[PDB]
């Protein structure tokens, strides 16, 4: 159950009358100001470091000339924490239409491109390949694979067989992701990158809770796999999209090392 009152009671200390409300997991919730102005985001006392983890990312990313949101304020009590962030105005990208979708492909490119331009060994934070994997081993090992997040075709196949078939690749992808490590925004799927509903060019990240070193395709495989829902029966673009992505963003495709982060990434939540 998420602790509404003693969170609702963190985000009404400072006597706003806000109308703060929930608007969407493991004991976490998100709330909206009245005015659509705030976001809050509120865990239990065992996750405050994750909270405080992610806290951390947004305030550094404000100093990175990479758009996202602001801290607003950072509470703590016994019953956990909030942290309270300026709104990304504008329409999340899981919401375009197909088009708003394309118009906004290259303008996409070229935002994920300035992110994974920020050197990598001055970012205070990682997401690399060994704690991610650590954190599937967990969340397998407490059985809290939520299969809903799976590839529609792993969806019924257990969840530590489908770790194993991963966990002998972790060396080459490794080794991949030392030649090649930018600084990912941690979790980049449609729903994290905000658009601008006039330009259509990116107004903003969000969600920036995983932040930090990993090889690129951490952050293409989400973006690519989620895109492609919206692409639908567009055969001919759906085809294309991701080499004319890539060929905007400059890297070459490796569809191996694309799919092994697909596939990686809906084991590490929970």
């Known amino acids: 159950m ?26 976490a919730a998100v709330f909206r100001s009245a005015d659509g102005s705030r976001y809050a985001k509120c865990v239990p006392a065992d996750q405050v470091a994750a909270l405080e983890a992610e806290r951390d990312r947004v305030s550094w990313l404000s100093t990175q000339d990479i758009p996202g949101p602001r801290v607003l304020d950072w509470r703590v009590g016994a019953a956990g924490a909030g942290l309270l962030t300026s709104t990304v105005e504008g329409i999340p990208a899981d919401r375009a239409s197909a088009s708003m979708l394309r118009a906004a492909w290259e303008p996409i490119a070229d935002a994920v491109r300035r992110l994974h331009e920020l050197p990598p060994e001055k970012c ?15 969340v397998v090992a407490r059985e809290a694979v939520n299969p809903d997040f799976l590839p529609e075709e ?28 930018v600084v990912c925004h941690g979790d980049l799927c449609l729903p994290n990158i905000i658009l601008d509903p006039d330009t259509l060019d990116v107004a903003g990240f969000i969600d920036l809770g995983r932040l930090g070193r990993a090889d690129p395709y951490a952050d293409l495989a989400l973006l690519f796999a989620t895109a492609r829902e919206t692409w639908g029966d567009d055969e001919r673009w759906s085809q294309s999209a991701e080499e004319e992505f890539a060929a905007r963003y400059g890297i070459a495709l490796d569809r191996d090392r694309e799919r092994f982060y697909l596939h990686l990434d809906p084991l590490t939540w929970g």
Do not use: C, K, N
Not at 14 to 22: I, L, Q, R, T, V
Not at 125 to 133: D, K, Q, S
């Open 124 to 138: 205070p934070f990682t997401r690399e390949l060994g704690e991610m994997f650590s954190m599937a081993r967990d």
């Open 2 to 27: 998420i602790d509404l009152t003693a969170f609702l009671t963190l985000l009404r200390a400072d006597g706003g009358d806000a109308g703060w409300e929930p608007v969407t997991e493991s004991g």
């Open 154 to 181: 792993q969806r019924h196949t257990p969840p530590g067989e489908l770790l194993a078939r991963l966990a002998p690749y972790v060396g080459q992808r490794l080794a991949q992701e030392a030649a090649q490590t």
